[PDB]
Structure 1
Amino acid sequence: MKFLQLPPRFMFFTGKGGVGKTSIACATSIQLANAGKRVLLVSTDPASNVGQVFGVDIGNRVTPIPAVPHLSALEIDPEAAASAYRERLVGPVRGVLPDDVVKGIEESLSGACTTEIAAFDEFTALLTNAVLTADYQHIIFDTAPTGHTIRLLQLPGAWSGFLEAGDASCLGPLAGLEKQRTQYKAAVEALADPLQTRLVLVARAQQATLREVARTHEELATIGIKQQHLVINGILPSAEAANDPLAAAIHEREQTALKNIPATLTSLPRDLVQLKPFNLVGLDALRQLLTIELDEPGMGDLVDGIEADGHGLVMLMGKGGVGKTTLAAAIAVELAHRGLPVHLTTSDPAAHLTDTLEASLDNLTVSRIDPHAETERYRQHVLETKGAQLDAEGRALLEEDLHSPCTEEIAVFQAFSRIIREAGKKFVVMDTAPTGHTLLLLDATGATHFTTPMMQLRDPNQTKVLVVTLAETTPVLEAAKLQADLRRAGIEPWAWIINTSVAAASAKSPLLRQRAANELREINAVANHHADRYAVVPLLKEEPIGAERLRALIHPQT
């Protein structure tokens, strides 16, 4: 394993949720501890099962693991840190200010951005404290700050009065940070030094995930992080597809993705972690990491319900890579084939799916919004309109703020609002929906680009915010977090779509069978608690492109 050769003190990991960052971090900690060097696995999520895996009740304090000699396990809680930020920044203004101001402060201080900044705060706490670096030879983190957070916290300063002064800006949480700016600067400097940091990039062997990790690598390199490594975790063994139709397609897709890694990631020391058969639960399985008839409702019922409740919006929401674009296209194609008008509006210019049928059907009008261009246009608009009077430091800080994911979400939502307005009395199937944070923040900043009123979205009779999940543990947990954010924003997700379900694809191989069992457990969990109306989409051995094979999703042959 190239990412483990002469590792520096801090070994971060990052990538799309569910790739296997935590499992790889745990296995690396085990391997280094076996080598005789003290380690400190800093799990960066309370919901992680690291404590169960090691058989210890890991908490905010360092808990040595008796099972693994020389291994200590910490567990940061970013969401707890964000809640503490809210408690210590909103209580003082509670009552002292009108309820509108308090609500705006809470909303600007709540969401994914505040969680990321709090996680970076804890990372800086662990990155500059002399006690930790003088006691453990390897502080193996589990998740790394996004490039945006590092860029924001490495700026010259002046981020001390951005609270109570929303304006669709996620720059407020900076005021919560109670530490010296020198602390964060030193943390970033130690993070960018190749001799103290090794920011590994865990990614699955799929096109979308590889492109996403390539983008993250480009951003991190722009930060200053020079030496990185790539861990392509999830490669399916070749011998597994020997006598199976679905495993053969999976392996072919994995190999095709490997042969077309983005040019930016080619030079990185690459690693390949096979899909180990035994489930990675407990220390026994992790020690060797680095070395059925499903009957659940399909998308037919969901599309039938949408058809029954006509003249509405069907906004697909969820984390990137789940399959929102393909599902939206399939829904739109099915609705068009039912005779009702549709206005499919995707936001994935790379994919040409449903472009072979836009003209064949006189009612399936298609709009292709380019997220990058919309984000750039919004950035220019708000830089010229706002911040022109700001001093050099304010302009730099606002420009850095505008690169946050929420700015891209706001720009895409603004571009989709005009699509909604133009198309009236017809279905409007979308690809992405703004997270609850974005919607609430836009609503707070009431006073050419326009955003649809929150009243229309909140009404169940005019909107249906579907939530797409990849049918795994962490993807389902983060989709549930998205659902909670939407519910806080007032919108009730109409249904759930458990996309890419190997369980519904009739797996006929060992590894795919164990994967099907895991995804069946996750589907049961989704049905019981998270969603009262869900649909499981089978995995397709042929990549969905065009109507003739997009309709396979909606109406599978079961």
Structure 2
Amino acid sequence: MKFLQLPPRFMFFTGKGGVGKTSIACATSIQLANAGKRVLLVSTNPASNVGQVFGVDIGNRVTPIPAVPHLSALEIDPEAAASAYRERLVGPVRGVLPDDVVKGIEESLSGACTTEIAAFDEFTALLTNAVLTADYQHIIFDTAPTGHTIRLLQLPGAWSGFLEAGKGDASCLGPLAGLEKQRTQYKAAVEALADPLQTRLVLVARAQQATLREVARTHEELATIGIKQQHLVINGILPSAEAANDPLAAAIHEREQTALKNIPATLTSLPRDLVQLKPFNLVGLDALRQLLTDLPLAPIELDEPGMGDLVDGIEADGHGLVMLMGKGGVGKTTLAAAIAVELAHRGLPVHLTTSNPAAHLTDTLEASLDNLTVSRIDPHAETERYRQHVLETKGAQLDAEGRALLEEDLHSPCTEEIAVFQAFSRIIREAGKKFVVMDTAPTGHTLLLLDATGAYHREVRRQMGTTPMMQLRDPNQTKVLVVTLAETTPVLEAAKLQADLRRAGIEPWAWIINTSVAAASAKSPLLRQRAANELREINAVANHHADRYAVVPLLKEEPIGAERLRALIHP
């Protein structure tokens, strides 16, 4: 593998959701550790659990993997990190200050900005601090889908620019934030990210035109940030030997070949590695030890409920919010577009929204349909809207110097997040009179947006003197659908997401097993084995996790445009 050639200390595996960042990161960490190196594997995705991949109980603590000598694993928990940050800020004054003052200080640290900054501080401590990672020769970061990862990697530069501009009064974080003591650390992080001899950035993609376009956009953004000498890894490439004697495999292979040949002109120069599709789920060392090397090398008739029944059930309501959630890459955007176009074709007023920052619905819907309002949440426009709204609502009474200080405070990088939340809330407020199909951002970001803990609400009311959850908790006006894949890790992640939703009072309305190879009768031996492995996950979802569910096959033609999207609802 090209990226496994004189690797630097740090290696970032970025890309669109579901492309194989975690699988490839685990495989490379295993390969490096087995070579005699001291490797640490950091997982920056809140919604994923590398313990299921490795079979060990990896947690926030740096836990060695017994199966692989010299390999250790770590998971950055935003909530645990926030609790540790709050404790280290509040403990010195426990008893010293009056209990009322302690309660007030704890109140000031309950906002979502503190939750963001704690995780960011842990990330930059892993990047820069030397004592913290002294006994590791390599640190492999496995990031969340690109939508959140680009913001994570932009945060170092944004915070460094905010601090070095002389505007250190990030009143959102509180008077005890003490951002200045991290001023150098953040700066160091930037210098660590933009140095090709310290960090290697690997963009993981799949042989699909939409994925390749999004990866090209991500590469443009990262190059703008300052990261140089990136590598590219195309994963899930169906072997060319399976195309024979299987029309489905032949169509998939032809589509992947065309996507590779039509790669965006920007990515044609990056050193490119190719990872094939394997007949087994990449769980455990036995399956992860043979991911980066090619395998030497009647169909199942599946009859499961379709998605037309779910769309009929949604339409029977006549209005409300349909929120699509799940693991990255499961097909949330495709299914959102399909539901929206089907409802629009049924003569209903539909509003299709995308909460993902790095979103482009044109990859799916390239037409201008009728009875369909397609929109997206632009973080920059929303940030400017929120900034102006706060300035006029709260800055009117403040004097000129007060208004200037408020403007400096509103320019902190955390503001965008709360701005996005506001936008999200506003959108959710229009679902009572028309269908609102919301394709959500990565699972962790969306779960924070739901604001079950009230952090975002506290922050926005602090900056500005019915919450979304009060509406999501009400089945009469919302329908949360969990999109999964008929695979081990996707199903476990969906089960954990469902548990998180139920803990907050939200009961998912249905499950959608997307791109199931079992449903699409496949004759090639590889696809036969994949379907055989998918049967158990389908049974687990049907009998255990989901009471109402739908199964969508693996379409031979990638679903793009109104015709194909409406066809996967009526197969």
**TM-score, reference length from structure 2:** 0.71
CA distance, structure 2, for counterparts of residue 407 and residue 511 of structure 1: 48
Contact 2:359–2:376 under 8 Å retained in 1: no
| Residues 118/514 of structure 1: CA separation in 2 closer, same or farther (3 Å cut) | farther
Q: 1: CA distance between counterparts of 2:112 and 2:540?
A: 24
Partners of 2:38 and 2:363 lie apart in 1 by: 56
Whether the 8 Å CA contact 2:207–2:256 is kept in 1: the answer is: yes
Higher mean Cα deviation, 418-427 or 26-35? 418-427
C-alpha distance 88-28 of structure 1, shift in aligned 2 (>3 A): same
Question: Corresponding residue for 1:517?
Answer: 532
Q: Structure 1 94/290 Cα, relative in aligned 2: closer, same or farther at 3 Å?
A: same
Q: Which of 449, 467, 480 is matched with 2:482 structurally?
A: 467
Per-residue deviation, 1:431: 4.4
Distance 1:518 1:151, change over 3 A: same
Structure 1: gaps of 5 or more residues: none
Preserved CA contact (<8 Å) 1:230 1:271: yes
Q: Deviations over 1:342-369 (max 9, x none)?
A: 5666799999999999999986677788
Alpha-carbon distance in 1 for matches of 2:96, 2:53: 47
Query: How many Å separate the matches in 2 of 1:99 and 1:315?
Result: 42
Decide which moves more: 281-290 or 431-440.
431-440
Q: Deviations over 1:121-161 (max 9, x none)?
A: 33434334444655333233333897988988998999999
- Is the contact made by 1:406 and 1:438 (CA closer than 8 Å) also made in structure 2? no
Deviation at 1:242, TM superposition (A): 1.8
Mark the CA change 1:375 to 1:172 in structure 2 (over 3 Å): closer, same or farther.
same
| Alignment partner of 1:260 out of 240, 259, 262 | 262
Give how far 1:3 is off: 0.5
Give the alignment partner of residue 345 of structure 1, picking from 350, 353, 359.
353
Could you tell which deviates more after superposition, 29-38 or 478-487? 478-487
For 1:12-42, what per-residue CA distance to the aligned partner results, in whole angstroms no more than 9, with x for missing partners?
2222343222322232233333444343334
Separation in 2, partners of 1:209, 1:466: 23
Superposition deviation, residue 263 in structure 1: 3.6
> What secondary structure, in the 3-state scheme, does the structure 2 residue paired with 1:175 have?
coil
Which deviates the most, 131-140 or 299-308?
Answer: 131-140
For 1:26 and 1:471, locate their aligned partners in 2 and report how far apart those are by CA, in whole Å: 21
Answer with 38-47 or 84-93: which moved more: 84-93
Closer, same or farther in 2 for the Cα pair 1:448/1:228, shift >3 Å? closer
Deviation at 1:297, TM superposition (A): 1.7
Q: 1:496 to 1:125 in 2, by over 3 A?
A: same
Alignment check: 8 A CA contact 1:167 1:441 kept: no
The alignment partner of 1:178 has SS state of: helix
Deviation at 1:212, TM superposition (A): 3.4
Give how far 1:230 is off.
1.4
The Cα shift of 1:119 comes to 4.6
Aligned residue number for residue 272 of structure 1 = 274
Q: After alignment, is 28-37 or 101-110 more displaced?
A: 101-110
User: For the residues of structure 2 that align with 1:550 and 1:248, how far apart are their CA atoms?
Assistant: 21
In 2: Cα distance, 1:104 partner to 1:250 partner: 59
Query: 1:148, 1:402 → 2: CA distance?
Result: 21
Whether contact under 8 Å (1:440, 1:489) holds in the other structure is no
Tell me how far apart the structure 1 counterparts of residues 313 and 98 of structure 2 sit (CA, whole Å): 42
- Measured after TM superposition, the shift of residue 197 of structure 1 is 1.2
Q: 1:552 to 1:124 in 2, by over 3 A?
A: same
Tell me, yes or no, if the aligned pair for 2:158 and 2:413 is still in contact at 8 Å: no
Greater alpha carbon shift after TM alignment, 527-536 vs 380-389: 380-389
2:302 maps to 1:303:
no
Provide Cα deviations, 1:416-445, integer angstroms capped at 9, x if missing partner.
888888898654545458989779879999
Worse overlay, 72-81 or 262-271: 72-81
Size of the aligned set, in residue pairs, is 555
Segment of structure 1 superposing worse, 521-530 or 425-434: 425-434
Displacement of 1:69: 4.9
Deviation (angstroms), 1:308: 2.9
Distance change in 2, residues 1:365/1:236 (3 Å): same
In structure 2, the residue matched to 1:553 is: 568
Quick check: 1:436–1:489 contact (8 Å CA) kept in 2?
A: no
Conserved? CA contact 1:42–1:75, under 8 Å: yes
Q: CA deviation at 1:273?
A: 0.9
Give 1:272 deviation, angstroms. 0.9
Structure 2 residue 155 is the aligned partner of structure 1 residue 151: no
Q: Distance in 2 between matches of 1:128 and 1:380?
A: 36
> 1:376 and 1:404 mapped to 2: Cα distance?
12
Deviates more, 1:191-200 or 1:490-499: 490-499
**1:551 CA displacement:** 3.6
Distance 1:360 1:221 in 2: 33
Moved more, 117-126 or 191-200: 117-126
Report deviation, 1:512.
Answer: 2.1
Residues 255/398 of structure 1: CA separation in 2 closer, same or farther (3 Å cut): farther
- Kindly state the Cα deviation for residue 239 of structure 1 after the two structures are TM-superposed: 1.3
- What is the distance in 2 between the residues matched to 1:350 and 1:145? 10
TM-score w.r.t. length of structure 1: 0.73
- Identity rate, percent: 99
Judge conservation of contact 1:497–1:534 (CA < 8 Å) in 2: yes
Q: 1:548 to 1:156 in 2, by over 3 A?
A: closer
The alpha carbon displacement at 1:228 in A equals 1.8
TM-aligned CA distance change 1:381 to 1:288, over 3 Å: same
- The one of 171, 174, 196 aligned to 1:172: 174
> Compared with structure 1, are the counterparts of its residues 79 and 23 closer, same or farther at alpha carbon in structure 2 (3 Å cutoff)?
farther
The SS at the match of 2:159 is coil
Quick one: distance in 1 between partners of 2:511 and 2:546?
A: 6
| Structure 2 residue ranges without an equivalent (≥5) | 294-299, 458-465
**2:127–2:192 contact (8 Å) kept in structure 1:** yes
Structure 1 vs Structure 2 CA RMSD: 6.3
Corresponding residue for 1:118? 118
Please say if residues 108 and 441 of structure 1, whose CA atoms lie closer than 8 Å, have aligned partners that are also in contact.
no
How far off is 1:468 after superposition? 3.0
Q: Secondary structure at the match of 2:207?
A: coil
Deviation at 1:4, TM superposition (A): 1.2
Distance 1:169 1:338, change over 3 A: farther
Of 119-128 and 536-545, more deviation after overlay is shown by: 119-128
CA distance in 1, matches of 2:410, 2:518: 41
* More off after superposition, 101-110 vs 367-376: 101-110
| Residue 538 (structure 1) shift | 1.8
Say if 1:352 and 1:545, in contact at 8 Å, map to a contact too: no
Moved more, 138-147 or 257-266: 138-147
| Shift, 1:509, TM fit | 2.0
Change (3 A) 1:262 1:91: farther
**Offset of residue 82 of structure 1:** 3.9
How far apart are the structure 2 equivalents of 1:413 and 1:544?
30
Q: Contact 1:168/1:441 (CA < 8 Å) preserved in 2?
A: no
- 8 Å CA contact retained: 1:161, 1:175: no
Task: Call closer, same or farther: CA 1:176–1:216 in 2, change over 3 Å.
Answer: farther
Q: Deviations over 1:294-314 (max 9, x none)?
A: 333211221232233234343
Structure 2 counterparts to residues 442-457 of structure 1, below 5 A: 456-457=471-472
Q: For each residue in 1:51-87, what CA deviation from the matched residue of structure 2 results, as whole angstroms up to 9, or x when unmatched?
A: 5766765555555556545444555555533454466
Contact 2:367 2:561 survives alignment (8 Å): no
C-alpha change, 1:100 and 1:112, in structure 2 (3 Å) is same
SS in 2 for 1:354: helix
Query: Bigger CA drift: 174-183 or 210-219?
Result: 174-183
1:315·1:463 contact (CA, 8 Å) conserved in 2? yes
Q: Secondary structure at the match of 1:158?
A: helix
Question: Contact (CA 8 Å) 1:13, 1:144: kept in 2 or not?
Answer: no
